[PDB]
Design a protein around this nucleic acid. Structure first.
Lengths: 240, 215, 153
RNA sequence: GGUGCAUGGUUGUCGUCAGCUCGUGUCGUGAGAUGUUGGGUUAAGUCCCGCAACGAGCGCAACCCUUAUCGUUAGUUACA
RNA sequence: GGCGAAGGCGAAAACUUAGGCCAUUACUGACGCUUAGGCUUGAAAGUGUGGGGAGCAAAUAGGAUUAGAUACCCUAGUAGUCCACACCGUAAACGAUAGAUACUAGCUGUCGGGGCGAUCCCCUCGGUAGUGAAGUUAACACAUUAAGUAUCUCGCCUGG
RNA sequence: AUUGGGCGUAAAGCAAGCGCAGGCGGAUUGAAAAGUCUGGUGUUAAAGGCAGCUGCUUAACAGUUGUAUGCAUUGGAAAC
């Protein structure tokens, strides 16, 4: 299949009493108790639209920057995506200053490359504090710039666990003219995505199946095998 | 308030522009008064060659002069006339019987000495070149030679009585406190029809390290 | 692109001893085919600020269509309690304004305008309101497609 | 001989401080902010972490001498 | 928290009664709307009129202190604060946001009313609040109770 | 500031409530058509002006033509 409705089984409900009303236009008529439940058919339609749209964008020799910044679950599974499909991954969101100022990513990636070279070229003269400085510089420039740590190419598309979760992601997204697609919740402002994906992320199955479907969409545009919507089994893994 | 660690840099981290040993404490004053005239005359008389520095040694009324320049071709000149003029001038300025031997050597990135930099910057300022463009010319002069970061200041008068309007350039790693830094600082007092103007340049010969002793 | 300066003024802040003597500049760029934009810059010298504001303006190009040699429709551009009137002035008078407004209109691709200012004489909100009014003009085909009736209106 | 508000150079006050400046760009409708800030952590913007931020530079430490144990070097007019 | 037209309403107890909140194709069938003029009310000082005056402080007066205290300290201390009457009818009576009218994301609170039901939760509508969307003030910010949206009427408004 | 502006802090909502002069009004329908359009005529002057021409050397100037311009008197319409 392709973006099967079988995955659309637990994409309902989040933290209540906090929700953007304009999501009720895009999700469903939500009760006074802030019922964060999502519809199935409209969510599936929008998810399939995003799927094949990012597929056709990545078939144009583009890039889908996979961003993972939630507690541990989204980040770990985005790293699994990166090790499954050749796409960039986020351990920690870049603090801003990547796209509109291209020099600021180039300096970081070059610094990390030279840091790796220095770590692999000399370790006898270094002291414990000097080695800690070197490792901390590596860690800093890897987390101060997650999507740009060894590559200089400008991403042609980026996702995020929540388009209101990351200010820098939105800034470097709206800097470019790209179809930004993101996992959107009820507490999220819908005005920061191209195709809204109204679905849950507090439920771990929901978000992991969603971003795995995104991984399959980018992989089928990269001519490599795809697993979800092609295997009927839904993943069961609690949100680490 | 405004000091550069160059006296300690020159002498225990580098050499002097005029170094010589002696056993008496009386002829030192005479030698130091005598050699400065030769140094100043050689600097002012030869700016087409951009004479970077002159080393003077003085022992028992025995004066020897060495010259390092950014453009030593003008020191020799066409058909080797300027070299003869320089040799006779230096031989006569040190004494009728004072010995003299000279060799011509060059330095990497020849326009790295702040002396000629400040002199040429003042010349550009007073040579139909606006102050901003003269600043840029001095910056290129230090930069196109192959030198490191640049500090350029021009203080004094704008033909007025105001002290709250000027421009100044800082570009790169210039530690005012690092002893082992190889920094050259020079000043020129230029006479304009409204006063004297100080043109100061701090130029890095290169961010030197592991070389902190005299050579 | 002409990259012409339109406004310079010295802006200063209070810091630990002394004030921030420095004059800022602001350039309007255009191509007279419709593209126009503006950009501000700060520097301590004339040419550096000129070039920085030139590049900042040239980073912003907003195209606008031609009607009667002027803007598409009458609009009173408002910004910061400042209003500047822009109209589809018929070509019977020419560009009648000061040098700044004449240049702003010319880099907008328009030949003439009837100017009208509302509010304070401070210039930065004059520029903001003028730019807002100029850029917010309408188009026939766009409003046709947006509306239920879509041929040209 | 003054005109140091004509100045060059010169040092000192705060204070050798605990911070400072600058670019990229972002956020403001402009003054401006950002980073450069803040939690841990220092004499220090010392670094980490987080944050439209990213870094470049300056001040304290940094080479320098000065300082101490040992090993060692040449050998008197030393030591012995 | 509610109400009262603002002025305001708190030891309790009763009465007259303005007015209120909830839902009524329910009835006249526009009877409407405001408001220059016009009607009434209007904190309070302080005025005199009759009592008591518990207490105190304008004023006044001593000791300080001060460059000097009838300023900040206090003691003595009247008008007055108290009440009955008028008049004073001004207030930071300003939300420096008019009255009548209808509409504009939400969200989290409260009170009152209607339904319901261990309580309750809940829904309805108002009142009473806010962050904030949109919208609107240069800006500060308001924002379903607007400074948002719009109709009728009036008052205020052009340099110190 | 109808054209062509405000009333929270850079004029500011009347001190509060009620009201007329005066002002405007919810829906349907009919009379009437003042408001409304419409059909016209009279006159609103030649000189003046808009468009046009002539001559004064050329307009300055002078002359000149279609045209202005506001009332009354006239067939209707029902949308309020």
């Amino acid at each position: 299949s392709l973006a099967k409705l079988g995955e659309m089984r637990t994409h309902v409900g989040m933290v209540k009493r906090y929700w953007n009303p304009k999501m009720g236009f895009f999700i469903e008529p939500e009760r006074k108790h802030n019922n964060d439940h999502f519809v199935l058919e409209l969510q599936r339609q929008s998810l399939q639209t995003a799927y094949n749209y990012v597929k056709e964008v990545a078939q144009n020799n583009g890039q889908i920057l996979f961003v993972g910044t939630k507690n541990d679950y989204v980040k770990k599974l985005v790293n699994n995506i990166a090790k499954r499909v050749d796409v960039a991954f986020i351990t920690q969101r870049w603090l801003g200053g990547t796209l509109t100022n291209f020099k600021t990513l180039s300096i970081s990636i070059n610094k990390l490359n030279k840091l790796v070279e220095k770590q692999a070229e000399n370790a006898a003269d270094l002291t414990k504090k000097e080695n800690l400085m070197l490792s901390r510089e590596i860690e800093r420039l890897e987390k101060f710039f997650g999507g740009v740590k060894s590559l200089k190419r400008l991403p042609n598309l980026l996702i995020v666990d929540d388009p209101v979760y990351e200010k820098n992601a939105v800034a470097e997204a709206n800097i470019l003219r790209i179809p930004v697609v993101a996992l959107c919740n009820t507490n999220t402002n819908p005005e920061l995505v191209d195709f809204i994906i109204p679905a849950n992320n507090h439920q771990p199955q929901s978000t992991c199946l969603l971003m795995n479907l995104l991984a399959d969409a980018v992989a089928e545009a990269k001519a490599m095998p795809t697993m979800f919507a092609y295997k009927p089994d839904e993943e069961i893994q609690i949100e680490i | 308030q405004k000091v550069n660690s160059n006296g300690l840099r020159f002498g225990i981290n580098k050499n002097w522009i005029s170094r010589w040993t002696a056993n008496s404490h009386a002829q030192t004053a005479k030698w130091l008064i005598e050699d400065e005239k030769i140094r100043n005359l050689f600097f002012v008389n030869y700016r087409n060659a951009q004479v970077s520095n002159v080393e003077i040694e003085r022992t028992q009324a025995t004066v020897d002069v060495f010259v390092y320049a950014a453009q030593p071709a003008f020191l020799i000149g066409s058909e080797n006339k300027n070299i003869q003029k320089i040799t006779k001038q230096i031989k006569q300025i040190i004494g009728r019987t004072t010995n003299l031997d000279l060799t011509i050597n060059e330095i990497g990135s020849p326009m790295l000495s702040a002396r000629i930099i400040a002199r040429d910057l003042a010349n550009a300022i007073e040579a139909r070149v606006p102050l901003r463009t003269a600043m840029r010319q001095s910056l290129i002069k230090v930069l196109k030679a192959g030198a490191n970061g640049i500090k350029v200041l021009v203080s004094g008068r704008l033909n007025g009585a105001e002290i709250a309007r000027d421009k100044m350039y800082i570009e790169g790693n210039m530690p005012l406190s690092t002893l082992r830094a190889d920094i050259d600082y020079a000043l020129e007092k230029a006479q304009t029809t409204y006063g004297v103007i100080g043109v100061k340049v701090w130029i890095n010969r290169g961010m030197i390290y592991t070389k902190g002793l005299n050579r | 692109f002409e990259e012409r300066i339109v406004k310079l003024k010295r802006i200063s802040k209070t810091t630990k001893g002394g004030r921030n003597m420095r004059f800022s500049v602001l350039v309007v760029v255009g191509n007279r085919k419709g593209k126009i934009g503006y950009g501000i810059a700060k520097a301590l010298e004339v040419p550096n600020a000129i070039k920085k504001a030139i590049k900042a303006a040239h980073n912003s190009l907003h195209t606008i269509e031609i009607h009667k040699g002027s803007i598409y429709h009458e609009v009173i551009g408002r910004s910061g309690a400042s209003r500047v009137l822009l109209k589809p002035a018929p070509q019977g008078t020419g560009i009648i304004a000061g040098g700044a407004i004449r240049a702003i209109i010319e880099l907008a691709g328009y030949s003439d305008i009837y100017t009208k200012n509302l509010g304070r004489n401070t210039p930065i909100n004059m520029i903001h309101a003028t730019m807002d009014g100029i850029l917010k003009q309408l188009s026939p085909r766009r409003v046709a497609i947006l509306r239920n009736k879509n041929l040209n209106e």
